[PDB]
Structure formats: C-alpha cells, structure tokens
Paper text:
The surfaces of most bacteria and archaea are covered with a proteinaceous coat, the surface or S-layer, which is formed through the self-assembly of individual protein subunits into a regularly spaced, two-dimensional array. In C. difficile, the S-layer largely consists of a major S-layer protein, SlpA, which assembles into a paracrystalline array enveloping the cell. The major protein of the C. difficile S-layer, SlpA, is post-translationally cleaved into two S-layer proteins (SLPs): the high molecular weight (HMW) and low molecular weight (LMW), herein referred to as SLPH and SLPL, respectively. These subunits then form a complex (referred to as H/L) that is incorporated in the S-layer.
Residue numbers in the entry:
A (entry chain A): 5 to 91, 98 to 115, 119 to 145, 152 to 172
B (entry chain B): 3 to 183, 185 to 230, 233 to 349, 356 to 416
Write the structure that this text describes.
C-alpha cells in the first residue's frame, strides 16, 4: 500500500487545507477513521493507530500538530499524502492554484493554448460525459481537470 | 474522487455549466484544441537547406516521439539545392536505404550539412571514418559537383554517385538501385508537381500484397520519361511491372502510354487532372495507395503539408525530403528494428500509418478537401506536419478543420 500519481483517490489544494484536516479529525473521533499514515514528499512521516495504546481524541490533536506547520509552509513541488483506512482511502495535498471556469459566461481554445492536458484523461472524460467522475454541485454540473503543465510558446 | 494528480500540476480547473450538454461542447472543444496544438507541428527554416536539416534532426537519430529512427543511421542520400530535375526520384531511394535525404549546395559542401552528416551517422572526433557509412549522391555534376564528391571521399566515406548523361537516364540509374520487387511509377518531367504527389506513396516499404512490411519489404521506384515513345533502356527496366503513370497528356503523351502497353503487356493506370492540385487530390483518394496499405483496421490519421510549384517549382523540393519521413510514420525504430517510445498487438507493420503530402501554397482546392475528407478515420486526425515556410495560414486553417485538430 503506497500512494503514487495516477491512482484512485482524492486531491486537495493547499487553499483547502483547513477543510480537509477538519474532515479527517472529525472522522477520526466519530469512529469513522481507524488508521492514518502521513507521507511528506513521498517519505513516511508517522503512523496514527487508534489501537496502538492511543485514543481517538488524542489522534485528532496529534494529526493537526504534525501537519499544521508543513502544510502552512508548502513549496512548489511539495506535497503531503495520507493513507486513510476506514476498516482504503488515499489523499494528496499540494500547493497548486485553483481557478474555476464558468462556461455560462475563458473559452476552450484559450485554455488549450496555455495548458497541456492528457489526451487519455480527456478522452475518457468526454465519453463518460455523453454516454459510455462528474458531480452535480448546487444546480451546476462541475468537472475537475488537472493539466500536466504549461504550453510552450 | 478517483484520481490523484501530479506533484507539480500548476492549476486545478473546475468547469461549471448549468447543463451537461454545454459541458460536452466545452470538453470536446478542449480535447480538439489540446490535441490540435501539440500534435500539429511545423518544421521549417529560412533557406531550403536548413529546412531539410531540421527535418532530419527531428525524425532521424532523435530521441523525441514520432520519429523514424531513434539511433544512428548508416546511409545518407544527398541531393543538390536546385536539383529538382535530377533527384526527384531519390525519395524511394532514401526510404529503402533507411537514410535521411539532405540538401547540399552545388559547389560548396555546407558546414551545416557536413555537421548533419556526422551527427546523424553518430560520427564523432573519437571515431575513425571508414567505408561502413555511405553517402548516395543523386544527380549529375550540376546537382552535386566533383568538388563536393571529392570532399566526402576525402573524409573516408563510401560515395556512390547515381548519375547519367540526362535527367531521364539519371532517374533510371536511381530506380535501378531501388529494388523493383512488380510495380512502378512514371512521370513526364513536364509536371514535377504531379511527381511530388506520388513520392510519399512510392517511398513506402510495401509488401507483395500491397500492405506494409518494414522488414524485408521494398519501396516502389519512379521513372522519368519524355512525353514520342519508350526508349531501349526504360523498356528493358519495365519487364512485367504494373506501371502507375502519373500526369496528364501534356506530361506524358498517349503514345508513351501505348508504348508501355506494348512493352510490359499490362494496362497502365492513369492519375491526372487539369491542375497540379487536382492530380494531388486523386493520388490521396486512391484506395490502393494509402487506405489499403494499412495492416491495422484504421484509416489515414497522419498528414503532411508542403508547397507546390505555383510561385516557383524549385520550392517543391521541400516536399521531396519529407517523403521518406511521411512513408514510414507512426512508428519509431531502434537499431534492431523494434518499436520504442523511449525504450522497448504492437507490431511495427501494424503500427505504421503513412502520411500523404498535400501540395498547397496559397489556397487549398475543393477537390483536395473532398479527397482528404474521404481518407480520414472516424476518430479523426492524430498528426499534422507543416514542412517549409511561406505556406498560407488559410490552408493550415482548413486542414485543422478537416482533421479536427
């Protein structure tokens, strides 16, 4: 069990640091998260096992104590990963910028001339958007995209 | 949920739309432009010499994807700058010989070229130059002078000159080096643009059945004859070959066609139009040229663009060097002849998809548009290459619409 790029799981930006840890903490206390393994820059940080002579209330405080300083001073290319076990779940926190494009208004040809997207990711996304993940958030149908890099000029 | 991203992904994007359909129109637009800005390439230089050099550095002995060879080459086919008359048929020659076709000046061997010769052959200051590397000189003394021949020989390279007393005899000397293993092509020399439209087809390493075999396969040679009758030599060269004559009556007369009828005993197929562009269109839409040469179950996904002889027929030499590239395209081969991406169902012959060269400088004809639309696969274009400068943006715009890139 190891976390690596291009794998099934959740991805959070540093802007959503405060929210991600809250859900991990509240999950830890309310008997919903059993074990957490933190990874700084792909290296093991420490293991939080509620059954390792520890407790849920201690584990909640311990989790924030370890990662509050790391995640508040993130650098370009620095990332923190979690192996969340509920009985399984994978998370990566990174310091990218978040930009939302409301189409009911940046066109696609300006988006492509700037960022380089993976064809195999867009291929599957197009197919599952018309026939053979996409979320419905407050009357809209949002889709998240992660470019591989910036376009040459 | 269900996908974690790269450590260095610059921005996280979220596409918000009231309706899923409007999102499909935005993802499709994104999918097309993203694959239409990275897959559409341009290889050019200020003069025709560096254009052929850049075309060599990218597709021969280059570590990038979508190249022909990823390792050293053992042969190089050299042609003069203003040598369109004698060297037009060198495209199938460079193809079977597995060599990059390079353009040199008539009297002086350019330092740019001599560096490219040493570079592409992995020739370096610590390696001695022996006769293990050959440089095929295609043309007479007005194509490549004796000054250039003796320089290449002074280094120690094995120099083979394919020349004759006339342009027609020169082409026969070239087509004799290209293994006629029973088909051929004939052009008149009055229309050189029609001959360039057939260069990518003739340079394909094809099998006996018409499919493609890059191992133990041969390319089909081209011959230039006067358009009169058939002379004593070309008739000897054409024994039982299926001639695919190219050009109108003004290029090769019906007398020349009838003489081939009497010579080889087979009916010669004729591809011609009123314009040099129309001849190109009919070559692209020929099933037995591109579509039926594919071992895979796809259609033509790769395309090339070059200038024609409207402004100056000399400019067409750009499409000549690109023919050996467009013939073997879609696969990258190492020293052993195995396909790679950086190293390495996925057989070479099954992965080859040649690309037709479209001739257009100022505008793209309606016939060329219809022909190119016929050969395209359902999944649409995957690679487009613009060789040379001076091609109008109108043409490239129309191509990107036809290929959906």
């Amino acid at each position: 069990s190891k976390v690596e790029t291009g794998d099934q799981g959740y991805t959070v930006v540093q802007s959503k640091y405060k929210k991600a840890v809250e859900q991990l903490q509240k999950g830890l206390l309310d008997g919903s998260i059993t074990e957490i393994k933190i990874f700084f820059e792909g290296t093991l940080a420490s293991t939080i096992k509620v059954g390792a002579e520890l407790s849920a209330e201690d584990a909640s405080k311990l989790l924030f104590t370890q990662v509050d300083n790391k995640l508040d001073n993130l650098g370009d290319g620095d990332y923190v990963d979690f192996l969340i076990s509920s009985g399984i779940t994978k998370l990566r926190i990174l310091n990218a910028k978040e930009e939302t494009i409301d189409i009911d208004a940046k066109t696609a040809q300006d988006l492509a001339k700037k960022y380089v997207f993976n064809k195999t990711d867009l291929n599957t996304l197009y197919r599952v958007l018309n026939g053979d993940l996409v979320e419905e958030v407050s009357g809209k149908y949002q889709v998240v995209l992660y470019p591989e890099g910036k376009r040459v000029t | 949920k269900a996908s974690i991203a790269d450590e260095n992904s610059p921005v996280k994007l979220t596409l918000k739309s009231d309706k899923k359909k409007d999102l499909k129109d935005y993802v499709d637009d994104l999918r097309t432009y993203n694959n239409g800005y990275s897959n559409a390439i341009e290889v050019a230089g200020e003069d025709r010499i560096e254009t052929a050099i850049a075309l060599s550095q990218k597709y021969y002995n280059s570590d990038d994807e979508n190249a022909i060879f990823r390792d050293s080459v053992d042969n190089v086919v050299l042609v003069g700058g203003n040598a369109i008359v004698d060297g037009l048929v060198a495209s199938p020659l460079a193809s079977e010989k597995k060599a990059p076709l390079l353009l040199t000046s008539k009297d002086k061997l350019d330092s740019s070229v001599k560096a490219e010769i040493k570079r592409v052959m992995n020739i370096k200051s610590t390696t001695g130059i022996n006769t293990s590397k050959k440089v095929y000189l295609a043309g007479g003394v007005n194509s490549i002078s004796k000054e250039v021949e003796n320089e290449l020989k002074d280094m120690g390279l094995k120099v083979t000159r394919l020349a004759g007393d006339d342009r027609y005899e020169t082409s026969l000397k070239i087509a004799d080096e290209v293994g006629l293993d029973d088909k051929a092509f004939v052009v008149g020399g009055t229309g050189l643009a029609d001959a360039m439209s057939i260069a990518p087809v003739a340079s394909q390493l094809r099998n006996a059945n018409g499919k493609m075999d890059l191992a133990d396969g041969d390319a089909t040679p081209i011959v230039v004859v006067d358009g009169k009758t058939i002379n004593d030599d070309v008739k000897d060269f054409l024994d039982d070959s299926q001639v695919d004559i190219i050009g109108g009556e003004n290029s090769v007369s019906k007398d020349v066609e009838n003489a081939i009828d009497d010579a080889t005993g087979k009916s010669p197929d004729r591809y011609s139009g009123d314009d040099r562009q129309a001849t190109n269109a009919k070559v692209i839409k020929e099933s037995s040229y591109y579509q039926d040469n594919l071992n895979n179950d796809k259609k033509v996904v790769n395309f090339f663009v070059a200038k024609d002889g409207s402004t100056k027929e000399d400019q067409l030499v750009d499409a000549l060097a690109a023919a050996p590239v467009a013939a073997n395209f879609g696969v990258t081969l190492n020293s052993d002849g195995k396909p790679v991406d950086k190293d390495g169902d996925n057989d070479k012959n099954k992965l080859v998809s040649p690309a037709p060269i479209v001739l257009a400088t100022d505008s793209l004809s309606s016939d060329q548009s219809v022909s190119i639309s016929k050969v395209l696969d359902k999944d649409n274009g995957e690679n487009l290459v613009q060789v040379g400068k001076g091609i109008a943006t109108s043409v490239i715009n129309k191509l990107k619409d036809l290929l959906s890139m």
